[PDB]
CSV table of N, CA and C in Angstrom, one decimal:
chain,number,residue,atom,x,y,z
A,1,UNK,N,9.5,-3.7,-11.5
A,1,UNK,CA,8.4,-4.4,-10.8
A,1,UNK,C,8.9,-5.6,-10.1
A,2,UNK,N,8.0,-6.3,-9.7
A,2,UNK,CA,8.3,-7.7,-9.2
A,2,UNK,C,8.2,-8.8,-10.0
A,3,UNK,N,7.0,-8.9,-10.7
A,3,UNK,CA,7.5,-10.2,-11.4
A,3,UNK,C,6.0,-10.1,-12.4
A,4,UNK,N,5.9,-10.7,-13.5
A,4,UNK,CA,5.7,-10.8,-14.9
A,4,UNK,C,3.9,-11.3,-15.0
A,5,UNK,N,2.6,-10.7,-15.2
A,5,UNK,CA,1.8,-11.6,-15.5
A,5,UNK,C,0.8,-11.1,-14.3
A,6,UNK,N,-0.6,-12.0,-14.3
A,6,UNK,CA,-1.8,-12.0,-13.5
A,6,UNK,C,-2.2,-13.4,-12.7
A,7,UNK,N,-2.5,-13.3,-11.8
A,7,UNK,CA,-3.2,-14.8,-11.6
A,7,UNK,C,-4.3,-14.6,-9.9
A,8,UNK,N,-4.9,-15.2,-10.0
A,8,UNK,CA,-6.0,-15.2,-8.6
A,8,UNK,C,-6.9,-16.1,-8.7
A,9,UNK,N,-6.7,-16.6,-7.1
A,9,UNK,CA,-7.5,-18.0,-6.1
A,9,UNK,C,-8.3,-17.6,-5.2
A,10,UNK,N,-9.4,-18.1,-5.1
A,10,UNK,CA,-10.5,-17.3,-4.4
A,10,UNK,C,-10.9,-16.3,-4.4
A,11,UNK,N,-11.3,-16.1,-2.9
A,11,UNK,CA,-11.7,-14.7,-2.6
A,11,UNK,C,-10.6,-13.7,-1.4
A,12,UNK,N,-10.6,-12.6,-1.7
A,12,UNK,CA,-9.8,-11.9,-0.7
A,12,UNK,C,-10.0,-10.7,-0.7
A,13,UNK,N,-10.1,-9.8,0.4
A,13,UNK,CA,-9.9,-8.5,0.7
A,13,UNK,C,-9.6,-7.3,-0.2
A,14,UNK,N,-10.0,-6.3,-0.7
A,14,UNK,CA,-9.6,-5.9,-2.2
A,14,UNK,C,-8.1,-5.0,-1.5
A,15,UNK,N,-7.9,-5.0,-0.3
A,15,UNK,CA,-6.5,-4.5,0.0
A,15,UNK,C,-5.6,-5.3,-0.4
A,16,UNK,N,-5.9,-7.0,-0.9
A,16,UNK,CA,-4.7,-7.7,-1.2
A,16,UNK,C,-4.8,-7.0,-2.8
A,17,UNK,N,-6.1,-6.9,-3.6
A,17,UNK,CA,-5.6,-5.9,-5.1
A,17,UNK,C,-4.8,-4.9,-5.3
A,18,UNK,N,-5.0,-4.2,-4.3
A,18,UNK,CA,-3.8,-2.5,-4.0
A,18,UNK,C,-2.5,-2.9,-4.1
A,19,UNK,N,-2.3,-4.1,-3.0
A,19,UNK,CA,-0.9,-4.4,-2.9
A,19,UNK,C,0.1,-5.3,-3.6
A,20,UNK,N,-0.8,-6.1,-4.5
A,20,UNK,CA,-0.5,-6.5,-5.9
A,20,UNK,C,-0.3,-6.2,-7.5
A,21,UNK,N,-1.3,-4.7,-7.3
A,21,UNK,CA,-1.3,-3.9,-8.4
A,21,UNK,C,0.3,-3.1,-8.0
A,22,UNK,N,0.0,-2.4,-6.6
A,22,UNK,CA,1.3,-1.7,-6.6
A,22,UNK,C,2.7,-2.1,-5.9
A,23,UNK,N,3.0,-3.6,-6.0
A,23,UNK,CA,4.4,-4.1,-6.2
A,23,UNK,C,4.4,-4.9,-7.2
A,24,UNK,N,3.3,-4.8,-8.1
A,24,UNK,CA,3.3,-5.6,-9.9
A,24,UNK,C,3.9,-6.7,-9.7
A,25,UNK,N,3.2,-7.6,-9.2
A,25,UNK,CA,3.3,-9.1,-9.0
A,25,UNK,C,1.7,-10.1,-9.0
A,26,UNK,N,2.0,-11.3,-9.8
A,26,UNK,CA,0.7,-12.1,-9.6
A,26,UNK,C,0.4,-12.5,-7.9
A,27,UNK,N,-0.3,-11.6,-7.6
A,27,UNK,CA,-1.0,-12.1,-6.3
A,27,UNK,C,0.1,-11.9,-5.0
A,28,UNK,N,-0.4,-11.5,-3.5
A,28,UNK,CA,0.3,-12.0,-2.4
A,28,UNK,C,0.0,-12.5,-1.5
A,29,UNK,N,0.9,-13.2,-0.7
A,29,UNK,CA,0.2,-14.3,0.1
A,29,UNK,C,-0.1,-14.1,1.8
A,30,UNK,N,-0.6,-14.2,2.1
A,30,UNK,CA,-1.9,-13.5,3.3
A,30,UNK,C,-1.1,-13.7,4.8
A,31,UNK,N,0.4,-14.7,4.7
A,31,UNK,CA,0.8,-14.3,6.2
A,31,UNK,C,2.0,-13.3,6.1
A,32,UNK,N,2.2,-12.7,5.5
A,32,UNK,CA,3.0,-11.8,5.6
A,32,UNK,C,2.5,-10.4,5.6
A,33,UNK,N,3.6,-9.4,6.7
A,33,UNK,CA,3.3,-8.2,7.3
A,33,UNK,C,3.9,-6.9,6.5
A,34,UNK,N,3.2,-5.9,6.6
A,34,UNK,CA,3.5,-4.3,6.2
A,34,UNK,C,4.8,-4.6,5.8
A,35,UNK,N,6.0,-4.5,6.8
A,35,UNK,CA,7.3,-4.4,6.5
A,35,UNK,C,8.3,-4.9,5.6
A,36,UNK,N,7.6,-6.3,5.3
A,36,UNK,CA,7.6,-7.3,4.2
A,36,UNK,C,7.3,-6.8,2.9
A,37,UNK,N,6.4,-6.7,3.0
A,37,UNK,CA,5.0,-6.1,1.6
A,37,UNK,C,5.4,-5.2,1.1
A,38,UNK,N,5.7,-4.2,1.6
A,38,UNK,CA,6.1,-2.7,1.2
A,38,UNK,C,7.9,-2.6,0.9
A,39,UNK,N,8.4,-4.2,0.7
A,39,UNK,CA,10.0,-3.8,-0.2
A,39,UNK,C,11.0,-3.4,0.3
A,40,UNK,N,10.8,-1.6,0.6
A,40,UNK,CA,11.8,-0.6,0.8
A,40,UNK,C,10.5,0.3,1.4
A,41,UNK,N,11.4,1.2,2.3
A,41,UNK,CA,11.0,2.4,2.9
A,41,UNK,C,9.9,3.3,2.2
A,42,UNK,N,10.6,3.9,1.0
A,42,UNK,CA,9.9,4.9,0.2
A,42,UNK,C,8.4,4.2,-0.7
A,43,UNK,N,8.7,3.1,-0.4
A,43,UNK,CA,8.1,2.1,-1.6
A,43,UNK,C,6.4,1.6,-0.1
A,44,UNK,N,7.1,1.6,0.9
A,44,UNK,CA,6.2,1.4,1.8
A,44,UNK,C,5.4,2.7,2.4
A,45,UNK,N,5.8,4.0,1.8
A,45,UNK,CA,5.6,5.6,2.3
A,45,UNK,C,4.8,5.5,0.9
A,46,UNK,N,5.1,4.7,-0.2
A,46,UNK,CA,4.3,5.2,-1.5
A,46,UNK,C,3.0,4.1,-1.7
A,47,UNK,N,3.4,3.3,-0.7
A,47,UNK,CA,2.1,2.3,-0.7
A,47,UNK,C,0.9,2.8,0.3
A,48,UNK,N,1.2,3.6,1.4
A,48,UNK,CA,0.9,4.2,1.9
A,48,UNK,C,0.0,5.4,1.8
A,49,UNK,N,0.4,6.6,0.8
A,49,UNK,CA,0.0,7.6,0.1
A,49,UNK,C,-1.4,7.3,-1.0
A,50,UNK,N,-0.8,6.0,-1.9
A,50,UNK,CA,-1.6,5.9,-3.1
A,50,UNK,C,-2.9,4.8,-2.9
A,51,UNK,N,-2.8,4.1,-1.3
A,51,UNK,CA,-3.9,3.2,-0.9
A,51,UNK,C,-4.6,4.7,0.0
A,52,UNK,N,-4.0,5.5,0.4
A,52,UNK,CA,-5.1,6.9,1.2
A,52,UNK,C,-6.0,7.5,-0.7
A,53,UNK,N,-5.1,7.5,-1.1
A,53,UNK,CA,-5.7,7.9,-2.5
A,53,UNK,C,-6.8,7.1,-3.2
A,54,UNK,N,-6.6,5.6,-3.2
A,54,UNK,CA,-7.3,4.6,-3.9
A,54,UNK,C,-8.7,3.7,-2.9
A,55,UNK,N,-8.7,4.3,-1.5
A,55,UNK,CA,-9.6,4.0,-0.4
A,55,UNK,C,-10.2,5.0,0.1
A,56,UNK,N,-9.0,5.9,0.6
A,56,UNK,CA,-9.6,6.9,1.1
A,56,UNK,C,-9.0,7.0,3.0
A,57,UNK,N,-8.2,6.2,3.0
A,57,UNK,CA,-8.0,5.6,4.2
A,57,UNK,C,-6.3,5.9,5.1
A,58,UNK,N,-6.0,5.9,6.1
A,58,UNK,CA,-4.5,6.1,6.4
A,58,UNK,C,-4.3,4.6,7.2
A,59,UNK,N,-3.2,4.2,7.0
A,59,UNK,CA,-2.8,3.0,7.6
A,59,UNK,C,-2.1,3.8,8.7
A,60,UNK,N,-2.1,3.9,10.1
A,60,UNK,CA,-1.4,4.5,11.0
A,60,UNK,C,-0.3,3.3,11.3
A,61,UNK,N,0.6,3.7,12.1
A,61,UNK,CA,2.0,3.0,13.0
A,61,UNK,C,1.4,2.4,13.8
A,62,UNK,N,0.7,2.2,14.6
A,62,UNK,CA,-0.5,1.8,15.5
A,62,UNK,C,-0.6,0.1,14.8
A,63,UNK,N,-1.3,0.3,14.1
A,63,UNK,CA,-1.8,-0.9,13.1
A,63,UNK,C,-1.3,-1.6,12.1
A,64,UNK,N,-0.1,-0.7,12.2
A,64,UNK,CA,1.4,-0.9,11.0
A,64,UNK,C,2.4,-1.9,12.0
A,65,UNK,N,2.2,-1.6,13.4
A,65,UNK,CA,2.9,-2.4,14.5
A,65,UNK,C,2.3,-3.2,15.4
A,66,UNK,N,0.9,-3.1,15.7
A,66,UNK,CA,0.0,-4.8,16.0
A,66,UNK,C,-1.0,-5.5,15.4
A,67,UNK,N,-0.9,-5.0,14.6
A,67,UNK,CA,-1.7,-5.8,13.4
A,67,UNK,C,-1.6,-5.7,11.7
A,68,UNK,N,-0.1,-5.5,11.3
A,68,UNK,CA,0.5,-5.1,9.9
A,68,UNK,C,0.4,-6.7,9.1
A,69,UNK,N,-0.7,-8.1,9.2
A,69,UNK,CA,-0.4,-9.0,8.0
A,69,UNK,C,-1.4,-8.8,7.6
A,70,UNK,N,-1.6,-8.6,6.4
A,70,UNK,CA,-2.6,-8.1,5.4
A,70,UNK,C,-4.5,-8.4,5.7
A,71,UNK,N,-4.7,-9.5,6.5
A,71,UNK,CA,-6.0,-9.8,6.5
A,71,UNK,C,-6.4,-9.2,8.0
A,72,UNK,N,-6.0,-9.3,9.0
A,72,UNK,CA,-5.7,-8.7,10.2
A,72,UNK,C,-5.5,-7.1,10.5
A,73,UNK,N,-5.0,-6.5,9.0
A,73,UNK,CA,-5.0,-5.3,9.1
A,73,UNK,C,-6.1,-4.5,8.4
A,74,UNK,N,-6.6,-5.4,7.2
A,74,UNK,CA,-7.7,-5.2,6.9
A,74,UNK,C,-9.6,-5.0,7.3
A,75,UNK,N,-9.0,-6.3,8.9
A,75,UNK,CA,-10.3,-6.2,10.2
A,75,UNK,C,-10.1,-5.0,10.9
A,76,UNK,N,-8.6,-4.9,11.3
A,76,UNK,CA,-8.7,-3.4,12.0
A,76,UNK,C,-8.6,-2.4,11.5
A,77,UNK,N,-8.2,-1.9,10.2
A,77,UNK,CA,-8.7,-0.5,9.5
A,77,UNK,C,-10.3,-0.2,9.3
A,78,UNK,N,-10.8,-1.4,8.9
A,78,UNK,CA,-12.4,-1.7,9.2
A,78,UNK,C,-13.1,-1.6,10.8
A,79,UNK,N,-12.4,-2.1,11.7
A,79,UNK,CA,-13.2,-2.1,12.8
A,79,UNK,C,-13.1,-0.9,13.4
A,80,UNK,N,-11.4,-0.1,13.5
A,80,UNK,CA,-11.3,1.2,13.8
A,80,UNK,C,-11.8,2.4,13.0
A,81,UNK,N,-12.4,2.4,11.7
A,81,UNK,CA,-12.3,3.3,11.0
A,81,UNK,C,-12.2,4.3,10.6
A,82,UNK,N,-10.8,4.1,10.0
A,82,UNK,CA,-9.5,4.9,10.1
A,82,UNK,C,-10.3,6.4,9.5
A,83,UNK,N,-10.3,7.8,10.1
A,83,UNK,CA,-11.3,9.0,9.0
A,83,UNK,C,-10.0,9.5,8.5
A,84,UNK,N,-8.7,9.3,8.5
A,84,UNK,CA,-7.6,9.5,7.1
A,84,UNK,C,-7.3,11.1,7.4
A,85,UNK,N,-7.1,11.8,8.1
A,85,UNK,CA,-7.2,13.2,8.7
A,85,UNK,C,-5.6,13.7,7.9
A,86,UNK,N,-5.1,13.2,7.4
A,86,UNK,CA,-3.7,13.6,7.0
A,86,UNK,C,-4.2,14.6,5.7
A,87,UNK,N,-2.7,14.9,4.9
A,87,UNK,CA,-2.4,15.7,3.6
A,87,UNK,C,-2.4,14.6,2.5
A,88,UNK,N,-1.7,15.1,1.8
A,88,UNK,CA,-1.2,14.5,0.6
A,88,UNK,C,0.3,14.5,-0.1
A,89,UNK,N,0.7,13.6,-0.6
A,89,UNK,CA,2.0,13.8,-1.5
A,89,UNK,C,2.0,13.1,-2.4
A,90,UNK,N,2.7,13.9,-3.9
A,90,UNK,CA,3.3,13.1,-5.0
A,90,UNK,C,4.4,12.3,-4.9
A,91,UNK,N,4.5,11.3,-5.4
A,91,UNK,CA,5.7,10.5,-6.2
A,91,UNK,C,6.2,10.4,-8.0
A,92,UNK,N,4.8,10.7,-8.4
A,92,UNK,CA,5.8,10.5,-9.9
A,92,UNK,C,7.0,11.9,-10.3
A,93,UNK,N,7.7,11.6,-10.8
A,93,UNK,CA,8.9,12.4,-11.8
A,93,UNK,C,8.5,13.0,-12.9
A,94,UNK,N,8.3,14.4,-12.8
A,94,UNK,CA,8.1,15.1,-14.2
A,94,UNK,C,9.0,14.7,-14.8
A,95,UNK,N,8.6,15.0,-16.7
A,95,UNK,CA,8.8,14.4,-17.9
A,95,UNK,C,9.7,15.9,-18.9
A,96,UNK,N,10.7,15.9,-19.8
A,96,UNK,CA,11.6,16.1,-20.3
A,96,UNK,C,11.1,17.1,-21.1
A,97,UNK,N,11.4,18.4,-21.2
A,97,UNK,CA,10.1,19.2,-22.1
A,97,UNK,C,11.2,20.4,-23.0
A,98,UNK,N,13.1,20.2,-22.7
A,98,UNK,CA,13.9,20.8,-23.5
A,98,UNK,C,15.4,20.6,-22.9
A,99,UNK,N,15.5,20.3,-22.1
A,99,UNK,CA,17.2,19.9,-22.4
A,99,UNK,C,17.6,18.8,-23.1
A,100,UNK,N,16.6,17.7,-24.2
A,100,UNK,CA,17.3,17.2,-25.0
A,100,UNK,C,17.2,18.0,-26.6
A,101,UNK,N,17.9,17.7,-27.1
A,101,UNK,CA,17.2,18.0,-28.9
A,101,UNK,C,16.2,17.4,-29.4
């Protein structure tokens, strides 16, 4: 994860909760963009997938490239309202069920 614990000031967008919960860090801070936020690639493809899962919603390239800082992207998934037309995919790793003893 990123770093250790809980903490929260004010009020904010529950997109900043998503993106807190899933880079496991106390809180993030509101001028920084998608590309930033999301780490690594797969990490930004899994933030991606599990906020379509946890909203209901697709963040397109569109909005990922003029409007990706967290409060600004949160007006425009709201103003354009995104209907999420895609599939789905896993990320977790099946679990160990006989090649050890």
């Amino acid at each position: 994860g990123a770093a250790a614990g809980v903490s929260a000031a004010g009020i904010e967008p529950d997109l900043t909760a998503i993106w807190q919960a899933l880079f496991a860090l106390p809180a993030v801070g509101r001028h920084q963009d998608f590309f930033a936020l999301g780490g690594d690639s797969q990490l930004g493809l899994r933030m991606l997938a599990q906020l379509r899962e946890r909203h209901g919603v697709d963040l397109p390239l569109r909005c990922l490239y003029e409007a990706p800082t967290v409060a600004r992207l949160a007006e425009t998934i709201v103003r354009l309202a995104a209907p999420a037309p895609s599939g789905d995919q896993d990320d977790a790793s099946e679990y160990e069920e006989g090649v050890i003893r």
